[PDB]
Ligand binder design. Structure first.
Ligand code: OC9
Length: 210
């Protein structure tokens, strides 16, 4: 009937990852409610289950020399970027076997958040994540272990979208990437985007936020 929200603020990817795993273990054990972590990461490139070297334009060494951290991870999808201004959410929820349903619920929540800003977004029939026309507003890539999810979504609020140009997604996709800031012509407060996400998750999952 409830989910717990934790706002971690700005946290390094590696430490936040360790925290994900600790939270996950507690949810698996039935010792913590379904938990939504909200946060930002310092500039980082991550490479998921479908990622290869072709997803990086430059060598890995270039990224680290130019202010990115870089990690290989077990979430769905290929390469992505997280950085300041991007609202990263890790719903660590007891989803059981129904992963596709869970993805659709994350998508629905993000579509609702966009609608709150007057923005028409959609999952699309063919591309992972949530899109506004031909541009990706929110990336989504999860992992599920012992029936509990981790990783999650990355909503571009005030992201430096130029940072996506150095990575090269593979497979079926639209043309570009976008953010609330780009769509609206002004920065949107991160505190507000977090609040809107919590409300959307509450509505979609039918749970009370604590
Ligand atoms: C935490 C959200 C990461 C989304 C990764 C999307 C990569 C799909 O190619």
């Amino acid at each position: 009937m409830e989910f717990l929200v934790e706002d971690l603020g700005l946290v390094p990817y590696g430490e936040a990852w360790a925290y994900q795993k600790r939270v996950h273990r507690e949810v698996v054990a039935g010792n913590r409610p379904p938990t939504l972590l909200l946060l930002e990461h310092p500039r980082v490139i991550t490479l998921g289950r479908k990622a290869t070297g072709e997803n990086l334009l430059f060598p890995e060494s270039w990224y680290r020399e130019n202010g990115f951290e870089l990690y290989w991870v077990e979430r769905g999808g290929d390469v992505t970027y997280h950085g300041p201004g991007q609202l990263v959410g890790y719903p660590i929820f007891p989803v059981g076997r129904e992963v596709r349903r869970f993805l659709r619920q994350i998508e629905e929540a993000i579509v609702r958040v966009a609608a709150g800003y007057g923005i028409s977004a959609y999952p699309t029939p063919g591309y992972a994540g949530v899109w506004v026309g031909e541009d990706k507003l929110c990336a989504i890539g999860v992992a599920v272990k012992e029936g509990v999810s981790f990783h999650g979504f990355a909503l571009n609020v005030n992201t430096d979208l130029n940072d996506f140009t150095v990575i090269v997604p593979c497979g079926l996709k639209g043309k570009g990437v976008t953010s609330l800031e780009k769509l609206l012509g002004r920065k949107v407060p991160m505190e507000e985007a977090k609040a809107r996400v919590v409300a959307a998750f509450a509505e979609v999952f039918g749970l009370r936020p604590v």
